[PDB]
């Protein structure tokens, strides 16, 4: 199966690459990823920029090489064996008509099915940058795949050296529902189950936490009593401080 682990180097390369090649809005940057993917856990362990150009006449007419792919994987192999190519890279502008159409060409020199990592590697979006997709036709049919990170023991320690709640999640929740409604209205208009049906009745009854509140309450007294002992304890420590001050004053008066 699938369960995808993604190098922080992948995200950071894609970022740096887009500015450094002077790639604007209304030009794509396309790439390759390789690692190990013949396993239940797809390991993305490296990646590389691919030469990509798109024409004035129609911008779903485009050029990707395959020779930069022929001999570059056989330089990837030579530092770390097991870092052949299984798929591909995108920075956006996202979800175009010919963003389907790199799939049939990338099927020519992959060993399973092109894995499509679109990533918002300008880091401009809000939330996830990773718009991961298994590249399946049928058109831009595009089942998404959830999973970023897992990296090496050395890299994570290095990451931390570089860098050195309920509401935020609720606001996200509100925005999805609000978006979902807007879509449903649009969808009726254009046209002229179960997941939605569990997302209404189930939550109707902090909402869920209500039913639970009965059980919570009993333990809730107990954990409250525990905080009260701690308050007494702070008072006890306090009394010593008052004495310390009291002593000093007393010595100053003798003297």
């Amino acid at each position: 199966h699938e369960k995808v682990t993604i190098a922080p180097l992948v995200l950071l390369s894609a970022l740096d690459h887009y500015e450094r090649t002077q790639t604007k809005e209304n030009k794509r940057c396309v790439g390759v990823i390789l690692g190990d993917a013949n396993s239940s856990t797809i390991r993305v362990t490296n990646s590389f920029a691919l030469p990509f150009e798109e024409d004035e006449k129609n911008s779903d007419v485009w050029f990707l090489d395959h020779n930069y792919i022929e001999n570059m994987n056989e330089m990837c192999k030579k530092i770390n064996a097991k870092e052949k190519l299984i798929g591909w890279y995108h920075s956006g502008p996202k979800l175009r008509a010919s963003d389907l159409k790199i799939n049939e060409l990338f099927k020519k020199y992959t060993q399973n099915n092109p894995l499509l990592l679109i990533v918002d590697v300008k880091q401009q979006g809000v939330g996830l940058p990773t718009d991961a997709y298994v590249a399946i036709e049928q058109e831009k049919t595009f089942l998404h795949l959830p999973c970023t990170i897992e990296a090496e023991e050395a890299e994570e320690i290095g990451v931390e050296h570089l860098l050195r709640i309920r509401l935020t999640n609720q606001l996200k929740s509100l925005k999805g529902l609000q978006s979902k409604l807007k879509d449903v209205v649009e969808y009726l208009d254009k046209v002229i189950h179960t997941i939605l049906g569990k997302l209404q009745d189930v939550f109707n009854l902090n909402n869920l936490q209500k039913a639970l509140t009965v059980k919570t309450n009993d333990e809730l007294m107990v954990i409250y009593i525990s905080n009260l002992v701690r308050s007494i304890i702070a008072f006890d420590d306090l009394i010593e401080n008052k004495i310390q001050n009291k002593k000093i004053q007393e010595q100053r008066v003798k003297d």
Binding site: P8, L9, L11, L12, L15, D16, H17, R20, T21, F48, A49, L50, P51, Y68, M72, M75, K78, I79, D120, V121, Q123, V126, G127, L128, P129, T130, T148, I149, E152, E153, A154, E155, I157, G158, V159, H161, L162, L163, I165, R166, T168, N169, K172, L212, T213, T216, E219, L220, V222, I223, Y224, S226, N227, V229, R230, I233, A234, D236, D237, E240
Partner: protein, 247 residues
């Protein structure tokens, strides 16, 4: 003056990735970028040389490899010139191996601003990376720049080259910095899940703080310790704030 070495996120990480896998019994390699000197030197990127059975010396820089790699980098925007060379070695405060200096010296007849940087993964598993950068001294620069320096003046008229330590710094963009901290979606959705499963386990976590408190009170008796108790009190407060938040 002399150099201050800004290493990029991807450069630092590549240095650690290659060095660890290439182990002592070494792999060697090249640093890429450029700078305009006297206070700005940048290492953008790095790549690995492919292990050669004569340890990590000038003989291990495969010139065809480096040439093919530089050309291919160029076609994807990432190619630049050598700003020095890096590796992996036994680790020394006087130079990580004998080979790295003897390689560095050949480079030094060409360049006059090329560094040797190595990270040693032996001492980078105490949870704090041990990384060094050293270069040899040059005449007519490190005496013209930094009684005056009698010491370093007799040193340069003398040896002509000797190790000196270069500073470790970092430089990274804001774009990287923003979009690490939404990974480190998994964190927000993971946060909901974690709250739910915490309330499940609370049966046990309850009981142990009950125990902690019994020890705590007993302790204060024996003394008559206080410090622990206060820390011990604070912690318990934090945990309840969390227990209440869950539900």
């Amino acid at each position: 003056t002399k150099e201050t070495v800004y290493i990029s996120s991807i450069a630092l990480l590549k240095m650690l990735k290659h060095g660890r896998a290439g182990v002592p019994m070494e792999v060697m390699g090249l640093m890429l970028g450029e700078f305009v000197d006297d206070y700005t030197v940048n290492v953008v990127d790095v790549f690995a040389m492919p292990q050669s059975g004569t340890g990590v010396s000038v003989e291990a820089v495969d010139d065809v490899f480096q040439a093919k790699m530089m050309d291919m980098l160029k076609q994807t925007g990432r190619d630049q010139m050598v700003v020095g060379w890096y590796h992996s070695h036994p680790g020394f405060g006087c130079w990580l191996s004998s080979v790295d200096v003897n390689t560095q010296k050949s480079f030094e007849q060409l360049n006059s601003r090329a560094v040797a940087v190595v990270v040693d993964p032996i001492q980078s598993v105490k949870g704090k990376v041990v990384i060094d950068a050293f270069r040899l001294i040059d005449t007519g620069a490190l005496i013209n720049n930094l009684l005056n320096k009698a010491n370093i003046q007799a040193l340069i008229h003398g040896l002509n080259r000797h190790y000196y330590s270069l500073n470790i710094d970092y430089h990274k963009t804001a774009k990287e910095t923003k979009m690490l901290m939404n990974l480190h979606y998994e964190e927000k959705e993971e946060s909901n899940l974690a709250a739910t499963k915490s309330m499940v386990k609370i049966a046990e976590q309850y009981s142990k703080r009950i125990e902690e408190e019994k020890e705590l009170t007993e302790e204060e008796l024996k003394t008559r310790p206080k410090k622990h108790l206060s820390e011990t009190a604070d912690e318990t407060l934090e945990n309840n704030i969390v227990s209440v938040l869950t539900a």
